[PDB]
C-alpha cells in the first residue's frame, strides 16, 4: 500500500508540474491572443465604416440583407478548440449550440452543422449529427486565411447546392480575463440598421457586393481570434484548477503515506516484541 | 488435510480427484490461533514460521502420479481471499509460489460485467497448453497474452486520439474477445463449444 501511495505521489507531482507549465504557457498565449484581437480592430472598424457608407449608397437588395421567404435550413458555425485541457470551453460552446438548435427547431428551421475544432466534431459525432464541412488545427492560433475559407464556405452555402436560408456563428466571447461567454450571432441575413448622421468606384452596388463577403470574412476572423483568446483563458483557468487539485492530492497522498509508514513501523515493532516476549 | 487424505486414497488407487480448499486463508488463521495458544513465537503478520509449510505440505500432495503408481491424479483449486485487492500480501504470495497458476478474480473487473472476473494480466497457468486439448491449444494458444496487451493498450489509449489503424483493430479484437469470455453462473460449456467460441 505504501508503494502505491508513493507512486501516486510521484505521479501527482509530475502532473502538477505539467499543469503549472501549461498554466504559464496559457498566460503567455492569452496576452498574445488578446494583442492579436486588438491588432485586427482597426481593419474591422474601417471596413465597417465604409460598408455603412456603401449601404447608405447601396440598394440594400443583396441576398445577405434579405430573409428567405420560407426559411428551412440554418447553418451553424460552432467554433471550438482543437485540443483539450480547456475546462468548460468546449462544453459551454456546445451547450450554447444546442440552445441555438432548440431555438431554431421551435421556430421551424432545420440546423445544419459547420464546425471548427476537433472537440466539437467529437461531440457531434457521438450524438449522430452530421457536419457538412469542418476545419481544424487553427483554434490555438488562427490566421486570416482560415477565416477567409470559412467565410467563403458559409457565404456560398447561403447563396445556394442544398444551401441554407440562414446562418449563425456560435463562439466564445472573450469579455475579460475572468469571464468568457458562449454567444451566437446571426451572421446572415444581416439586419439593415438605420441610424442618424461620398464617391464610389466602379459603382456603389458592385463595390458593396464585393465588400459584404469581405466584411463577413473579417467578422468571422474576429470571432476566431476571440475564440482563441477565450480558449487560452479557459486553459489557464482549468490548468490552475488542475494544479491546485494536484497539490491537494499530493497533500492527501503524503498524509496517507505517512500514516502507512507509521503503521508499518508500529506493526514491525509489534511483531518483533511479540517474538521477544515469547522468548 | 482430511480432504487431501480422502482424495489421496483415491489418487493412489488410480482415480482422478479434484480438491477445492475454500478458503486456505482461514486455515492459516486457524493455525495462527493454534500456534499462539501453544505459545509459539509468531513470525510476520503474527503468523507462525511454518505457515508456508502448512500450505506446501498440503498443496504439494496434489500430483499426477506416474503409470507405475497407478496413473491417478489430484487437482487442487485452493481459494484465497485477498485483503483490499492486494495479491502481493504474505499468504497470497506464499500460496501463489506453491501453486501452478493463478485465477485472480478482481472485483473491478467483476463490477465492469467481466464475469468470471479473471484478471488476464496477473492470471497464468504454468501448465499452459499441455493441459488443453489440441484444438483448444491451436485456437487459443496466444489468447492470454493478446488479452493482456489489449488491457495494456486500453489503459494507454483511453485518452488518445491519434490511434493507428492497427491499434484500433487490436482494441476492437480485444473488446470482442472480452465479451466472448463473459459467462453467466451455472452455464458450463463443453470443450467443443468452448473451442468453437474462441475460434
Amino acid at each position: 500500500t505504501l508503494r502505491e501511495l508513493r507512486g501516486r505521489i510521484r505521479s501527482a507531482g509530475s502532473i502538477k508540474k505539467i499543469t503549472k507549465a501549461q498554466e504559464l504557457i496559457a498566460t503567455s498565449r492569452i496576452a498574445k491572443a488578446q494583442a492579436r484581437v486588438e491588432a485586427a480592430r482597426p481593419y474591422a472598424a474601417e471596413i465597417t465604416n465604409m460598408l455603412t457608407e456603401l449601404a447608405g449608397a447601396s440598394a440594400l437588395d443583396h441576398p445577405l440583407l434579405v430573409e428567405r421567404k420560407q426559411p428551412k435550413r440554418a447553418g451553424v458555425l460552432v467554433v471550438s478548440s482543437d485540443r483539450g485541457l480547456c475546462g468548460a470551453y468546449n462544453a459551454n460552446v456546445l451547450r450554447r449550440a444546442e440552445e441555438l438548435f432548440s431555438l431554431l427547431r421551435d421556430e421551424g428551421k432545420d440546423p445544419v452543422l459547420y464546425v471548427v475544432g476537433r472537440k466539437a466534431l467529437g461531440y457531434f459525432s457521438f450524438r449522430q449529427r452530421t457536419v457538412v464541412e469542418s476545419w481544424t488545427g487553427f483554434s490555438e492560433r488562427p490566421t486570416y486565411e482560415n477565416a477567409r475559407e470559412i467565410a467563403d464556405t458559409l457565404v456560398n452555402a447561403f447563396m445556394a447546392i442544398l444551401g441554407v436560408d440562414e446562418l449563425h456563428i456560435v463562439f466564445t466571447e472573450f469579455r475579460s480575463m475572468l469571464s468568457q461567454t458562449a454567444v451566437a450571432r446571426r451572421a446572415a441575413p444581416m439586419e439593415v440598421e438605420y441610424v442618424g448622421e461620398y464617391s464610389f468606384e466602379p459603382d456603389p452596388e458592385t463595390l458593396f457586393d464585393a465588400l459584404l463577403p469581405r466584411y463577413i470574412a473579417t467578422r468571422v476572423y474576429a470571432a476566431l481570434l476571440e475564440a482563441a483568446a477565450s480558449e487560452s483563458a479557459s486553459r489557464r483557468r482549468a490548468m490552475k484548477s488542475a494544479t491546485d487539485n494536484a497539490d491537494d492530492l499530493i497533500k492527501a497522498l503524503t498524509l496517507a503515506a505517512n500514516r502507512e509508514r507509521q503503521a508499518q513501523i508500529t506493526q514491525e515493532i509489534s511483531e518483533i516484541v511479540g517474538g521477544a516476549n515469547a522468548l | 488435510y482430511t480432504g487431501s487424505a480422502i482424495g489421496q486414497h483415491w489418487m493412489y488407487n488410480g482415480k482422478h480427484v479434484l480438491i477445492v480448499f475454500d478458503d486456505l486463508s482461514k486455515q492459516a488463521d486457524a493455525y495462527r490461533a493454534i500456534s499462539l495458544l501453544l505459545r509459539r513465537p509468531p513470525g510476520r503478520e503474527a503468523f507462525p514460521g511454518d505457515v508456508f509449510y502448512l500450505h506446501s505440505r498440503l498443496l504439494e500432495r496434489c500430483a499426477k502420479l506416474s503409470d507405475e503408481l497407478g496413473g491417478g491424479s489430484m487437482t487442487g483449486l485452493p481459494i484465497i481471499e485477498t485483503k483490499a485487492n492486494d495479491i502481493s500480501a504474505f499468504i497470497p504470495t506464499n500460496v501463489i509460489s506453491i501453486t501452478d497458476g493463478q485465477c485472480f478474480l478482481e472485483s473491478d473487473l467483476f463490477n465492469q460485467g467481466v464475469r468470471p472476473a479473471i484478471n488476464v494480466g496477473v492470471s497464468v497457468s504454468r501448465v499452459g497448453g499441455a493441459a488443453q486439448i489440441k484444438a483448444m491449444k491451436e485456437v487459443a494458444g496466444s489468447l492470454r497474452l493478446d488479452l493482456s496487451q489489449y488491457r495494456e493498450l486500453e489503459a494507454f489509449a483511453a485518452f488518445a486520439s491519434d490511434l493507428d489503424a492497427a491499434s484500433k483493430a487490436q482494441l476492437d479484437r480485444g473488446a470482442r474477445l472480452v465479451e466472448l469470455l463473459k459467462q453467466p453462473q451455472y452455464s458450463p460449456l463443453a470443450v467443443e463449444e468452448q473451442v468453437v467460441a474462441i475460434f
Binding site: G56, R186, M190, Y215 | -
Partner: peptide, 29 residues
C-alpha cells in the same frame, strides 16, 4: 465451421441570439 459461421452471419440480426447588422448611416429608409 467457417462456412457455417458465414451462413449464420447472413441470417443474424444485429441489435444496431445576437443579430449582425449594417448601419445605413441614415435615420430612415
Amino acid at each position: 465451421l467457417v462456412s457455417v459461421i458465414n451462413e449464420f452471419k447472413k441470417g443474424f440480426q444485429a441489435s444496431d441570439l445576437e443579430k449582425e447588422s449594417v448601419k445605413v448611416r441614415k435615420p430612415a429608409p
